[PDB]
């Protein structure tokens, strides 16, 4: 199986796999059962921004979600990611719909990763517009770029309606080196902005930012509640 | 008095104010009595690098010191810096000597600060060479730039010998805005490289990176063990 570290913006409460009974943000370490959650005050039709950071001295993964002029939600978890992840990884975003649905529109995505050895290596990307044929992104499943230059992670109809039972992802083309033998310290920071809309009072299922093995693929069975990240709910 | 947050590279153990009995790195929050220390494997005559980071969601200040090919030392402390510090600050480096002494040579210094509001603001500087008349630095006390483009925080003789009972600092000219009312998240990262040499088996006293009120000045009495940061040892 893949090795997965994610931050979930989870809009649909699946109590049976341990979601709290409200939309929330989560830190996912090699499971869909979030190590740490916080109440997400979901605003449909409103553009949101998520920021994520981590470094290897502090060993705390953190995320904050907000909407313009509105309050913020934060989530943190103490974890040494270089004991969890392999040295080389790819970074990406995922989303799903299920029985219920929502547009999973990414308007922009940026990412910075640094590696210092005791003897600096660096990668940075930002997309504020996605191109119609994004050579620097590996698009998986249902994911596509639209005419407005937005990245849609899940299916929508020509008229704009989201569809159910969809899974999509986008990975940055280049692998990222997150730890080394002579390494002193590593860190990363990521930002995206997103637009989720639904014709459902209980929109579903959510969006993640994730880091994984370089050859990561959409696992069979990973639909709806599993956010296109895990083959099961263990 | 000033409001002070620092990371100390402390070479001289003053047990009476709570130093451990070995060189160490420390997180100083509004006292010289470090909230968190770690054993510093001091290497005199060897160039070292220190990296420091923090963000306001994670609320963990961290630092790591190393020398080329040699092992690392890390220190961390959970602290919400925006409850400790004022909104506007200046950043700087300090050093001292006392009865014992050491060169306190800074070879390079860099700093990045970010502020995001829910509606990004940014500052970055790096010096890999300091100029002979550094208009972008506020030099305090004994601090000067030499002909090699290094920043010497404390007195040295023309022949290169460090002198005792010296205090010096360098602040970045521009104030930094670290928190706001509508702010979502703030972070900073700082790096310097340093060269400490001594004709003493017990070199003294150390170097800090620090953040403080914008009108910060060398406090009277702040010499030797107080690292040019605090008027007393409380
Ligand atoms: O999109 C929302 C959810 O729809 C599905 O689970 C269901 C939620 N309500 C239901 C009601 C009936 C049945 Br049948 C099913 Cl599987 C479900 C599944 O696809 C879940 O993974 C997903 O989280
Ligand atoms: O530079 C080392 C130290 O020298 C001084 O403290 C002393 C260390 N050894 C001593 C021995 C004698 C006397 Br007198 C004094 Cl004050 C001291 C003081 O200046 C200290 O602040 C400083 O840490
Ligand atoms: Ca869910
Ligand atoms: Ca000391
Ligand atoms: Mn969840
Ligand atoms: Mn100390």
Number of helices of chain A: 0
User: Ligands bound here?
Assistant: 5-bromo-4-chloro-1H-indol-3-yl alpha-D-mannopyranoside, calcium ion, manganese (II) ion
Instruction: Indicate the radius of gyration of chain A in whole angstroms.
Output: 17 Å
What would you call the structural class of chain A? mainly beta
Estimate nothing, just give the exact number of structural domains of chain A: 1
Say what oligomer this is. Answer: homodimer
For the record, the CATH architecture of chain A stands as: Sandwich
Report the β-strand fraction of chain A as a percent range: over 45%
CATH class group of chain A: Mainly Beta
Written account of the structure:
By secondary structure, the first copy, chain A, is mostly beta strands. Chain A has a single domain (1-234), classed as Jelly Rolls (Sandwich). Chain A is built from no helices and 16 strands. In chain A, the strands form two sheets. In chain A, strands 1, 2, 3, 7, 10, 13, 14 and 16 form an eight-stranded antiparallel beta sheet that branches. In chain A, strand 11 (144-145) and strand 12 form a beta hairpin. Chain A is globular and about 55 Å long. The two termini of chain A are 13 Å apart. The PDB classes it as sugar binding protein. Keywords: Jelly-roll motif, Lectin, Carbohydrate/Sugar Binding. It forms a dimeric assembly. Crystal structure of Dioclea sclerocarpa lectin complexed with X-man. Chains A, B are Lectin alpha chain.
Structure in a nutshell:
2 copies of one chain form a homodimer. Helix content of chain A is 0%, strand content 45%.
């Amino acid at each position: 199986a893949d090795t997965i570290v994610a931050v979930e913006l989870d809009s649909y409460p699946n109590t049976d796999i341990g979601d709290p009974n409200y939309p929330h943000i989560g830190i996912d370490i090699k499971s869909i059962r979030s190590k740490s959650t916080a109440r997400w005050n979901m605003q449909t039709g409103k553009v949101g921004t998520v920021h994520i950071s981590y470094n290897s001295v502090a060993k705390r993964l953190s995320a904050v979600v907000s909407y313009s002029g509105s309050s913020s939600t934060t989530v943190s978890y103490d974890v040494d990611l270089n004991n969890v992840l392999p040295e080389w990884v790819r970074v990406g975003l995922s989303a799903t719909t299920g029985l219920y649905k929502e547009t999973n529109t990414i308007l922009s995505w940026s990412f910075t990763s640094k590696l210092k050895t005791n003897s600096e290596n660096s990668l940075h990307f930002s997309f504020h517009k996605f191109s119609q044929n994004p050579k620097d992104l590996i698009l998986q499943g249902d994911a596509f770029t639209d005419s407005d230059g937005n990245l849609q992670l899940t299916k929508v109809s020509s008229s704009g309606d989201p569809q159910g039972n969809s899974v999509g992802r986008a990975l940055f083309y280049a692998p990222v080196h997150i730890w080394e033998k002579s390494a002193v310290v590593a860190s990363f920071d990521a930002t995206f902005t997103f637009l989720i809309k639904s014709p459902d009072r209980e929109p579903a299922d959510g969006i993640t930012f994730f880091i994984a093995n370089t050859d990561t693929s959409i696992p069979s069975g990973s639909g709806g509640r599993l956010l296109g990240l895990f083959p099961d709910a263990n």
